[PDB]
Amino acid sequence: DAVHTDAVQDWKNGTINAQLTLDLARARMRLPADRTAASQFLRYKAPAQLKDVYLSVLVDSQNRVGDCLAHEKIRLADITALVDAGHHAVTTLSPSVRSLQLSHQTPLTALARLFVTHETAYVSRPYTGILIDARGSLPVHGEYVSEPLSACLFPKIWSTDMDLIYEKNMVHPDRAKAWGVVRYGSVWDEKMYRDRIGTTPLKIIARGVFGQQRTDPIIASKDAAQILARPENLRLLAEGNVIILCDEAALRVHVPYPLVDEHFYFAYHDVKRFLTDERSPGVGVRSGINTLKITVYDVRFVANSPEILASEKDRVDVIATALKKMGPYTRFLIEGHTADLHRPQEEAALSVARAQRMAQELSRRGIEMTRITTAGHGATKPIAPSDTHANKAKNRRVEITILRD
Ligand SMILES: [Cl-]
Ligand SMILES: [Cl-]
Ligand SMILES: [Cl-]
Ligand SMILES: [Cl-]
Ligand SMILES: [Cl-]
């Protein structure tokens, strides 16, 4: 609490960077008398905070390292092996007075190599590499929205026919461990990336993106065909001669406050298994880097509705239980939406009413109202056209964001 962590996932340079700062004034310490005790205390605090940063790294289209831990795909000791900062000094280079700082960097390949377990790779013009331009907003496969690509340790490349073109297991494992399956780049670097993709790369535009976490570029079949056409080009996949260009927001992911530990990921795993077992219709869950969002589709009730249907009583029961599984030290943002009724005034009020009713229903199930904030967005944030019943039902929803408090 006297110790604060700032951290950035630098996908462009392939490193996770952290700065841990000790506020001496807050910790009741003074320089130079307490330099050693203060420095040792910062070194004492650093391992757990660094561990939490590393859990936040996106591994693939669905999971972060913390999720993989929860699924027992990796061991906590493999992560803590990476948080030794004894090669770094405790300095006064902090921008704040009466502060000490400890900086630590870990290559992203150190995390990636924990997931490389395969033995051998599985398997026009000749090219020296593959350059995917995945900048901008990309249509999301299987959805109506368009979103930018997120970087991760193990992206996949799909064709528009959803043939799998590139995957971790296609890479020689030694090479996967040495320099990952891709490098992410910026158009502003004005680099050839000759090291990665040589002088004559195959330049390809991303036509879409796949994944819960929007990680997998989708490329035109004609472009996929070029890759698969020659041994020379197929060897590019085996060697990992692949660059993905993306936007700057994706290239530097700032790790938000506060940091969540392994227990957040364990609790989310429980929530997911719970919802999967309850099979509550039209309830989905997704995580951000330190939030969870439960989305309840086809919510029709409002603040002035009669006592809600039995079937809805059961669903809100399931939601309430799921929310509670994330523990007592959270708060909730409940946001209502409507389908496009061509009635903006009504949509505005209705979306607020929907969120209000959800909040009231949850507070009769043990979630104190002081923990809840409500908002309504009318039809202004659609996730589908409002043409069919099914698509209108998708828009008509309440999103519950679980936040640290
Ligand atoms: Cl001081
Ligand atoms: Cl030192
Ligand atoms: Cl996915
Ligand atoms: Cl509606
Ligand atoms: Cl209106």
Numbering used by the authors: 63 to 185, 195 to 476
Q: Can I see the authors' text?
A:
Treponema pallidum subspecies pallidum (hereafter T. pallidum) is a medically important spirochete bacterium and the causative agent of syphilis, a chronic, multistage systemic disease transmitted sexually, through direct contact with an infectious lesion, or in utero. The T. pallidum protein Tp0624 is annotated as belonging to the OmpA-OmpF porin (OOP) family. The C-terminal region of Tp0624 is predicted to adopt an OmpA domain architecture, but it is unclear what role a canonical peptidoglycan binding domain might possess in an organism that contains an unusual form of peptidoglycan and has a divergent cell envelope ultrastructure. Treponema pallidum transcriptomic and proteomic studies have shown that Tp0624 is expressed during infection, yet its precise biological role is unknown.
Further complicating the functional prediction of Tp0624 is the observation that the N-terminal two thirds of the protein does not show significant sequence homology to any functionally- or structurally-characterized protein. The presence of an OmpA-like domain suggests a potential role for Tp0624 in peptidoglycan coordination and cell envelope stabilization, which could be facilitated by the uncharacterized N-terminal region. To gain insight into the function of Tp0624, we first determined its three-dimensional structure, which revealed a trimodular architecture incorporating a highly divergent OmpA-like domain and a previously uncharacterized tandem domain with intriguing implications for peptidoglycan coordination. Moreover, compared to conventional Gram-negative bacteria, T. pallidum has an inherently fragile cell envelope composed of a chemically distinct peptidoglycan layer that is thinner and more spatially separated from the outer membrane, as well as periplasmic flagella (endoflagella) that are located between the outer membrane and the peptidoglycan layer. These ultrastructural differences suggest that treponemes such as T. pallidum may harbor divergent molecular strategies for linking the peptidoglycan layer with the inner and outer membranes to stabilize the bacterial cell envelope. Collectively, these data provide insight into how the unusual cell envelope structure may be stabilized in the human pathogen T. pallidum.
